[PDB]
Amino acid sequence: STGSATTTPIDSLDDAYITPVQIGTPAQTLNLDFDTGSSDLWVFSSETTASEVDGQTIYTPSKSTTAKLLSGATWSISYGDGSSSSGDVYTDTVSVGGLTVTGQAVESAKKVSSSFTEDSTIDGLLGLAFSTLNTVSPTQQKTFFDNAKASLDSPVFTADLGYHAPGTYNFGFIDTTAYTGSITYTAVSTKQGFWEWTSTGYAVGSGTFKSTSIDGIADTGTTLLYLPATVVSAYWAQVSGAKSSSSVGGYVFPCSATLPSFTFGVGSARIVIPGDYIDFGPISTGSSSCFGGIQSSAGIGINIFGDVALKAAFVVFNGATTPTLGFASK
Ligand SMILES: O=C(NNC1=NCCC1)c1ccc(Br)cc1
């Protein structure tokens, strides 16, 4: 089997991407944030505290003939941005882009934190990291990908995120028309439950490439590119007037600037992030200070190749017995 679904930016900044997902019988379509940095499929629901729902589409398990309470199971998750959610669990039929899994754990939110409430466009998350990170207790549950894997034509999914435009998540096949040149594959460590890999270095603009190992995760659920402070300082030093602002919470730059590109290494290959991808716009409405898309990972404990980086590439998440990651230009 295979599946193919379009993923769409939630706003003009590409702050996140949403992908329609069919849950239950008859189908209830919710727009979920596909997150390769976590491993829970959770949704706003008929169980979500009413004051914490503001415009989202909800899953109502009582209206699904295939929903079953997973008795005794609860879940609770915190994300890197300080957001969180928790609740109980159903199993139900879940389809993405024509690919169907029966018996998928669908985690129903009883509580969500304010950032989720305030984002009317995201109806939940669909985790695509390794199932060892799944938070369901007392019986950990599998991700949609892990449940689908054995049925897939090939045990892979791909992320092809757009810059200010829709893109695609494919399951079970590599669309050879969706990228240019060749795909360079690189080793993955699953020891922390993430798609963790080692970039071979970077360049800023037209500058020389610096060969240096940068361990990080491929995380579709993080907006920005978080890299070591040395690397980030070297980037922003090339932008007149750029500075790290403790009050704003990171690097800012004059909105009048033209940003340089940023290149990262994948083995001997190179992925170039155009400068425009690194512009996250005014820090507040009407401001001439703009927020940068490359920020320091200091204090995170790991580097994060979030959407800013991933959307510059066609990315293969190879879930074979020994997982790997592939990157191609596009
Ligand atoms: O939470 C993480 N990724 N997903 C999402 N973030 C916000 C909503 C979804 C995340 C994962 C690993 C590390 Br290290 C830091 C952050």
Catalytic hit among 33, 35, 219, 307: 35
DSSP single-letter state for residue 189: B
Does the annotation count 40 as an active-site position? no
**Separation of alpha carbons 143 and 284, rounded Å:** 37
- Specify the fold of 5-174: Cathepsin D, subunit A; domain 1 (2.40.70)
Query: How do beta strands 3-9 and 225-227 pair?
Result: unpaired
Can you read off the two tokens belonging to residue 292? 């940068």
CA separation (Å) from 249 to 252, 260, 310? 9, 21, 23
Q: In the block, which residue shows the tokens 């703009």?
A: 290
SS (H, E, C) 223-261: CCEEECHHHHHHHHCCCCCCEEECCCCEEEEECCCCCCC
Copy the structure tokens of residue 294: 């490359």
- Which helix (H) or strand (E) segment is 234 a member of? helix 229-236
Residue with token string 């409405």: 285
- Atom 4 of ligand 1: nearest residue by CA position: 221
Tokens standing for 36? 């390769």
Assess contact for 23 and 30: CB atoms under 8 A: yes
Q: What experiment produced this structure?
A: X-ray
Beta-carbon contacts of 282 under 8 Å, excluding residues fewer than 6 positions away, are 255, 288, 289, 290, 291
Spatial distance between the Cα atoms of 29 and 211, rounded to a whole number of angstroms: 45
CA distances from 309 to 16, 223, 242, 285, 315 (A): 13, 9, 20, 25, 10
Residue type, 276: D
Q: Give the Å distance between the CA of 207 and the centre of ligand 1.
A: 31
Of 320, 152, 221, nearest in space to 10 by CA? 221
The continuous run of DSSP H or E covering 281 comes out as strand 279-282
Q: How far apart are CA 149 and CA 153, in angstroms?
A: 8
Distance (Å, whole) CA 280 – CA 283: 8
State which ligand 1 atom lies nearest to the alpha carbon of 129.
11
| C-alpha dist (Å) from residue 54 to 14, 48, 112, 119, 122 | 21, 11, 11, 8, 11
CATH 2.40.70.10 placement within the chain:
5-174, 175-330
Q: How far apart are CA 120 and CA 207, in angstroms?
A: 41
Contact residues for 253 (Cβ-Cβ < 8 A; gap 6+): 236, 239, 241, 242, 243, 259, 289, 290, 292
Question: What is the side-by-side order of every strand in the sheet holding 269-273?
Answer: 269-273, 262-266, 196-204, 210-218, 303-305, 225-227, 294-296
With the most atoms of ligand 1 within 8 angstroms of its CB, the residue from 134, 135, 197, 222 to mutate is 222
Give, in degrees to the nearest 5, the angle at Cα 110 between 109 and 114: 80
Rounded to the nearest angstrom, the distance between the alpha carbon of 219 and the centre of ligand 1 is: 7
CATH hierarchy code of domain 175-330: 2.40.70.10
CA-to-CA distance for 229 and 233, rounded, in angstroms? 6
Six-digit token pair at 253?
Answer: 């730059």
Closest by alpha carbon to 157, among 127, 115, 192?
127
- Contacts with 301 (C-beta within 8 Å, 6 or more apart), sequence order: none
**Burial annotation 70-88 (CB, 10 A radius, 16+ → b, else e):** beebebebebbeebebbbb
Question: 31 C-alpha vs ligand 1 centroid, how far in Å?
Answer: 18
Q: Tell me the C-alpha distance between 166 and 7, whole Å.
A: 6
Residue 279 CA to residue 276 CA, distance in Å, equals: 5
Decide: 81 in ligand 1 pocket, CB within 6 A: yes
Tell the residue nearest (CA) to atom 9 of ligand 1.
Answer: 221
156-160 and 314-318 strand pairing: antiparallel
Report the alpha-carbon distance of residue 182 to residue 267 in Å, rounded.
Answer: 12
Distance of alpha carbon 322 from the chain centroid: 22
Q: Whose alpha carbon is nearest atom 11 of ligand 1?
A: 37
Is any atom of ligand 1 closer than 6 Å to the C-beta of 193?
Answer: no
Element at 118 (helix H, strand E):
helix 114-118
- With a 6 Å cutoff on the Cβ, whether 257 touches ligand 1 is no
SS3 23: strand
d(CA 6, CA 20): 8
Experimental structure resolution, Å: 1.2
Tell me how far the alpha carbon of residue 169 is from its chain's centroid: 11
Cα torsion at 227, 229, 234, 235 (round to 10°)?
40
Of 220, 225, 101, the closest CA to residue 169 belongs to 220
The yes-or-no answer on residue 35 being catalytic is yes
Give Cα separations from 74 to 109, 258, 291 (angstroms). Answer: 10, 48, 38
Assess whether the C-beta atom of 207 lies below 6 angstroms from ligand 1: no
- Dist CA 186 CA 196 (whole Å): 10
* Residue tagged active-site, from 64, 95, 131, 199: 199
Other CB atoms within a 10 A radius of the CB of residue 213 amount to 9
80 lines ligand 1 (CB under 6 A): yes
Is the CB of residue 122 below 6 angstroms from any atom belonging to ligand 1? Answer: no
Helix (H/G/I), strand (E/B), else coil: 321: coil
Q: In this structure, which residue's CA is closest to atom 16 in ligand 1?
A: 80
Nearest CA residue ID for atom 8, ligand 1 = 221
Nearest CA, atom 14, ligand 1: 302
208 SS3 class:
coil
